[PDB]
Ligand SMILES: NC(=O)c1ccc[n+]([C@@H]2O[C@H](COP(=O)([O-])OP(=O)(O)OC[C@H]3O[C@@H](n4cnc5c(N)ncnc54)[C@H](O)[C@@H]3O)[C@@H](O)[C@H]2O)c1
């Protein structure tokens with residue numbers, strides 16, 4: 001490995017999925033850690049074999065600029081802190097890997113891209129599904145016209161949000177989160193509908209409801225259903241939920257056949273099947289090594305901040321629709337650089 | 341088989357699913373046939389062993405009143421003709437088995453129930469899913485609280501509608517159909533959401549879209565998506581499609597687990613699974629029989645068929661207006677789901 005990563009935020013996703021993910025990389029390596037807790041970091045640094053000399057925090061973060069071995073930083077902090085460290089990261093002349101959602105604002109999304117252009121460094125959002133062989137296979141068979149003309153997409157993404165003092169979970173603060181289940185996980189359905197169909201929604205409608213007596217959803221929504229229409233005439237209906245167990249299910253209906261992905265966006269072995277009348281590339285690794293190679297070849301990354309912005313913007317539209325009860329035009333010429 | 345059935349409409353569903361369905365019954369029997377074609381009726385009567393002496397048509401239909409071995413009639417004609425023969429059937433003092441949708445109007449749905457009460461005969465709608473062991477099993481495990489508190493239901497029901505001169509498919513003609521994919525098959529999703537959740541939607545929202553250049557959907561809709569909310573706070577989002585292949589898929593999300601029915605409402609072996617012996621057709625036929633043989637109300641009454649029709653109307657209204665539609669009108673499924 002010759003591409004150094006600086007992991008910012010040693011939380012659940014970092015510790016459980018990302019750090020272990022490095023094991024399969026073939027270019028990436030954990031060069032430095034960052035966290036508001038040295039004790040934790042220490043144990044971590046040891047654990048993954050990183051010299052404790054590279055354990056920073058949110059104060060001396062900018063210090064990374066003086067370490068050329070640190071090719072890039074990987075933000076894995078609450079959504080609101082995304083833009084802050086993304087820019088500071090670019091200011092230190094380093095490529096950025098930012099987790100989804102890109103940010104809690106469309107503005108910050110644009111700002112981040114700016115900073116990136118400035119520092120002349122790459123900005124990649126954590127859409128691991130864009131590096132999951134299973135999803136890529138689904139996409140392949142759809143493009144090979146095995147479903148025929150696509151007409152109805154259906155998505156659902158849910159998981160029970162811990163009730164343990166909602167004041168604790170940053171996902172339940174509109175400030176740190178930016179939204180409820182949609183921002184957190186529905187985004188997988190939204191994002192998937194787009195790359196599965198290979199096009200953008202031109203119109204959007206939605207509705208949301210959260211129990212008024214549930215302490216968890218005082219700031220962020222629990223359940224929200226959205227419906228979209230595309231230029232090709234394809235349609236979709238999806239939802240995200242914070243009060244029902246694990247659900248990761250996508251269905252794509254064509255005139256020839258129907259595709260079923262269940263689980264669709266899970267951490268381990270996703271399943272896809274077709275109804276007609278992962279060789280050395282787990283998502284995590286492939287995601288990390290994808291930013292590396294992009295740099296090592298000046299080639300554009302598959303999941304740019306422009307894509308992360310498109311989702312955030314759509315997510316706003318969807319929330320707007322749910323708020324007004326009216327459809328919302330989203331036909332603003334966005335275009336997937338590189339494809340889906 | 342002491343219950344005599346008079347099959348009205350020897351079409352695809354009658355010939356392919358219903359007639360053969362009798363083979364498994366244990367009370368029902370094919371006593372008479374009815375159809376605007378005695379030639380076929382003949383071949384059919386022979387085929388299933390019915391004396392050609394009982395082959396009627398839409399003119400001498402009422403004649404059935406003079407045959408006491410004829411306990412009931414089974415309407416299997418286009419949706420618009422449902423109410424007409426349902427009432428005439430009751431007028432001849434005979435229990436009625438009417439296929440879904442009950443009718444193309446809420447009024448006719450009420451009228452049919454009236455006629456039924458009058459003739460003091462029973463009225464049962466063809467919701468075979470209410471007699472499918474697989475569905476009943478799904479319902480059982482939900483009631484046993486294996487999913488926990490229900491929060492998100494998802495349904496999809498689709499099948500490609502033949503393009504062969506749409507002036508040929510009574511389903512593509514508003515008057516005979518009453519609606520598009522919703523009336524025809526979405527109804528399974530709507531109906532299933534209700535008996536799976538064991539409650540009624542109090543609010544409804546929907547949207548529909550059909551290609552303006554497709555000859556098929558000039559009168560009836562191709563695809564329509566509807567979202568509903570229930571009293572328990574549960575939610576649902578479903579759709580029906582006339583332009584995409586076979587899809588019969590239901591998912592029910594609880595806080596404990598998730599139920600997946602796929603296929604959910606098929607003719608043969610449906611599948612259900614949870615993530616943390618008999619057959620609908622026969623059981624449906626024998627269900628009307630026994631109900632009579634015991635002065636016991638049937639599980640799928642015309643009141644239930646009306647509720648769906650009324651809901652479908654509110655869903656079409658919503659799709660038309662683009663605003664939510666209140667459906668909290670106190671309906672109640674006597675007996676249960
Ligand atoms: N792509 C995926 O599969 C996936 C899955 C899980 C999480 N995520 C994303 O990664 C990010 C982190 O999620 P997570 O589950 O690891 O969260 P977490 O709460 O477990 O981790 C948060 C990290 O940021 C730090 N932090 C900084 N300020 C904080 C504050 N104000 N309050 C609480 N935490 C604070 C914590 O110390 C910790 O290191 C989010 O943007 C989330 O949406 C993506």
Ligand SMILES: NC(=O)c1ccc[n+]([C@@H]2O[C@H](COP(=O)([O-])OP(=O)(O)OC[C@H]3O[C@@H](n4cnc5c(N)ncnc54)[C@H](O)[C@@H]3O)[C@@H](O)[C@H]2O)c1
Nearest residue numbers: 349350351352353354375416417418419439440441466510
């Ligand atoms: N529960 C189920 O599984 C299921 C499945 C299929 C059909 N159905 C229902 O059963 C009924 C019949 O459907 P089908 O597929 O058998 O239809 P079909 O067109 O194959 O059969 C229609 C029958 O009614 C007669 N008919 C009377 N007037 C007609 C007219 N004006 N034009 C065309 N047909 C006319 C035909 O001769 C034929 O015997 C419908 O109400 C349908 O919704 C239910």
